[PDB]
Design an enzyme around this catalytic site. Sequence first.
Site, short mmCIF file in Angstrom:
data_model
loop_
_atom_site.label_atom_id
_atom_site.label_comp_id
_atom_site.label_asym_id
_atom_site.label_seq_id
_atom_site.Cartn_x
_atom_site.Cartn_y
_atom_site.Cartn_z
N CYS B 93 -39.02 -9.02 -7.96
CA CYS B 93 -38.08 -10.05 -8.41
C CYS B 93 -38.22 -10.39 -9.88
CB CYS B 93 -38.23 -11.30 -7.53
SG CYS B 93 -39.29 -11.08 -6.08
N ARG B 122 -50.57 -4.94 -3.26
CA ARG B 122 -51.13 -6.21 -2.83
C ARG B 122 -52.53 -5.97 -2.28
NH1 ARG B 122 -46.12 -8.63 0.26
NH2 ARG B 122 -44.42 -7.91 -1.09
N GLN B 140 -40.83 -0.71 -1.54
CA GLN B 140 -39.78 -1.47 -0.87
C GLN B 140 -38.42 -0.97 -1.31
OE1 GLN B 140 -41.87 -5.71 -0.13
NE2 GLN B 140 -40.52 -5.68 -1.93
N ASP B 142 -35.99 -2.57 -2.20
CA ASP B 142 -35.77 -3.92 -2.67
C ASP B 142 -34.47 -4.03 -3.46
OD1 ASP B 142 -36.46 -6.74 -3.67
OD2 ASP B 142 -38.38 -6.07 -2.85
N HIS B 144 -32.08 -7.56 -5.59
CA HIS B 144 -31.81 -8.98 -5.81
C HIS B 144 -30.35 -9.14 -6.19
CE1 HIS B 144 -36.10 -8.43 -6.11
NE2 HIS B 144 -36.23 -9.70 -5.75
N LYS B 224 -36.71 -17.25 4.76
CA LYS B 224 -36.33 -15.90 5.00
C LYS B 224 -35.95 -15.53 6.40
CE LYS B 224 -39.92 -14.48 3.19
NZ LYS B 224 -41.20 -13.94 2.65
N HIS B 270 -32.95 -12.37 -2.17
CA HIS B 270 -33.91 -11.28 -2.05
C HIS B 270 -33.70 -10.61 -0.71
CE1 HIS B 270 -36.61 -13.55 -5.07
NE2 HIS B 270 -35.60 -14.35 -4.78
ZN LIG Z 1 -37.81 -10.62 -4.38
#
Ligand SMILES: [Zn+2]
Lengths: 401, 399
Positions: B93, B122, B140, B142, B144, B224, B270
């Site tokens: 993000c 992580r 991910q 991912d 946004h 979420k 997200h």
């Molecule tokens: Zn995010």
Amino acid sequence: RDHRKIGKQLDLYHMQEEAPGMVFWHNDGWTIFRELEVFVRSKLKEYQYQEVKGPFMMDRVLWEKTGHWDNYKDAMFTTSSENREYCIKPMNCPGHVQIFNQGLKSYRDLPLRMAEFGSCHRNEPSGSLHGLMRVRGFTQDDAHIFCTEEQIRDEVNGCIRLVYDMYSTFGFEKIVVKLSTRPEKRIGSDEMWDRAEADLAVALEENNIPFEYQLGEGAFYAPKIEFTLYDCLDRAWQCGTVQLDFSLPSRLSASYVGEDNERKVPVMIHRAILGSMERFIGILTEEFAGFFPTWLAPVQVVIMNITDSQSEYVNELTQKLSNAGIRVKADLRNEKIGFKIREHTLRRVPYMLVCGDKEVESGKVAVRTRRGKDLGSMDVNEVIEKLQQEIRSRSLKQLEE
Amino acid sequence: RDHRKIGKQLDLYHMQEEAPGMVFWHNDGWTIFRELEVFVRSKLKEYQYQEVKGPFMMDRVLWEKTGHWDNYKDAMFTTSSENREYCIKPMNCPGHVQIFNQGLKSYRDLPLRMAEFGSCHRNEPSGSLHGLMRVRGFTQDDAHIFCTEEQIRDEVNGCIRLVYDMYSTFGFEKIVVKLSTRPEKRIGSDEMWDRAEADLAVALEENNIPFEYQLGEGAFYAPKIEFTLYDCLDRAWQCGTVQLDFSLPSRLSASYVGEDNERKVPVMIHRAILGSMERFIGILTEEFAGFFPTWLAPVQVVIMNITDSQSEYVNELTQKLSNAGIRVKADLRNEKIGFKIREHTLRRVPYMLVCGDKEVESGKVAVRTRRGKDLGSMDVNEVIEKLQQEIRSRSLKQL
Ligand SMILES: [Zn+2]
Ligand SMILES: [Zn+2]
């Protein structure tokens, strides 16, 4: 003609001081990155390469074993977890050897060509950073070939052939070849270095490739053949490299069962053809002055109307071109046609399609190129077919060019 | 049906103690990874997503601004360079907001959908690591979405539609949805959390999605929606997630010029559809027991000769199938044909092509599957077209 200036002009990427030497790839720049990946993968399939992916960080003890820690500490990022220290990989060779070490290998498995678009992180001095050409995080079109001593000539020749094969797609006229010999800090015996350096020289001589020696510029484990490309200021940038390594597989306990049923240590050949995607894109940006070949252009076609009267027609054409696999955008702004043409020419969009009532009615398009040429009107389906041929062939020249 | 055991048998990946929680993707496993990337990219073109790539590390001052350093410190890998700290990014993000902040944005640019196959790292506790399901480094799918307040309903609806569209390709029967509310440790005011939690709850109900609340399990920045898939022993794994965020764009100075020519802060959504490629591949491996659908199979076809006499003919077919876009390998080893078939059957190769003398003379091929089905002699071009259709449609079952 500076790739940093062209990169901002085309919205390819940006960099900021919260991450020195680290590239933020925007949508258009990432498109060029991904097209090069597709181009490389087409060559990996042709030359029968595996493609793998190693982890980002590994234990420091492994990098100590290779000799990387002693000869490469200053350039390595380190991190820790649970009282154990890890190194962010500056190279992909140890990771590929780890993959090779899984399962028993025989001579029937050789040559084993293992490629990776591997992320490398090197703590380069901040004063030496320069745009995309010298960064701290980069992706190499890396590969490692595990083979026998008898296969060295054939495999090294294959790497040299691949370099000129893929460089010819971009029409490079100046490719300077160098043989980097042993550095002051190195591992391996003098006899091994003499054999490794002679092997690379013979391979170049066999391919009738003129070259010069670059004393002391080889890796700490192996000598290098360097393929050098030049920027707008005619500065030399190392892109292509093929390395003949007799030391690292032994350090990492790599072995295979030979014909004699005796355990043998494989020879490893390191090679990156483009070098890094970041540096090669910078070279391509300055070589073409932003006039990327159509197959590389972030936006290949812009379709644009005169008034609203053609706005519906423009939208249909954009969808039709998009379904044909062409990166196409519609420009329906309330601006003069000359204004739109000048803006997208600055964006180095290869083709601009102009749609009036004449074209709406005739189902045709008026074609204009970023080089200022007026190609006249011809049918939409003919434009699609020519564009697809230009893209699939990765042609360097445009229509009627 | 344990994915770690299947992954070892099929040479998909391996893990070592010198890199805990870090995956060595082998050629066959990386092929599945790249095919999912192709599948995701095809969908994201349909939904008009940008694709970007953020850098690996950024200054710790960045993660202080977002609140990550206070709410995410212990799980972050850190490094040093020239007396400065850098955080190995655990999320994408902040990087996407930085790209968003480059250049002036207006309401005409919204909704701006910005996607990335983002590598996240992580420092998960080593006792919680489990195969591909929970790792320390993962990728991910991912993205946004920067949008206005009025665009929240449509954009969240599009995210939910994307989840079931892509999940239906794999034929998942049990998809459990949970709504995770505000955690103890959070940023943003209570009123924003009231609105964000209500918006996600309304979206789930409007989409006819039964769900259960997961109190305190939301992100420290947003609630979420969690899409849960189950492994061989029915353990719950969070893969899909949609997060409604009213705080991060303001903290990172994201803004756009509205229709009223006033500076406005965009809403950020997200979302990750598959979740992580590593966890999703693990889910797929256990779901199919290593019998990956043909479009996902690392090697789709193996062509073998019975003797040397057909070795040429096998080579021409291998080139002709490969030129047709099929991942095909030739097995010309000096082994009994029955030995060759068994090896590729155990590797779950969808189709095996056997070429005897009669196949060479007739220009045909003998086709058998990894499930033991014998399809007899079939025309070569009939093989290729049926194979291409199976890969094209991403079919779940062999025709
Ligand atoms: Zn995010
Ligand atoms: Zn190497």
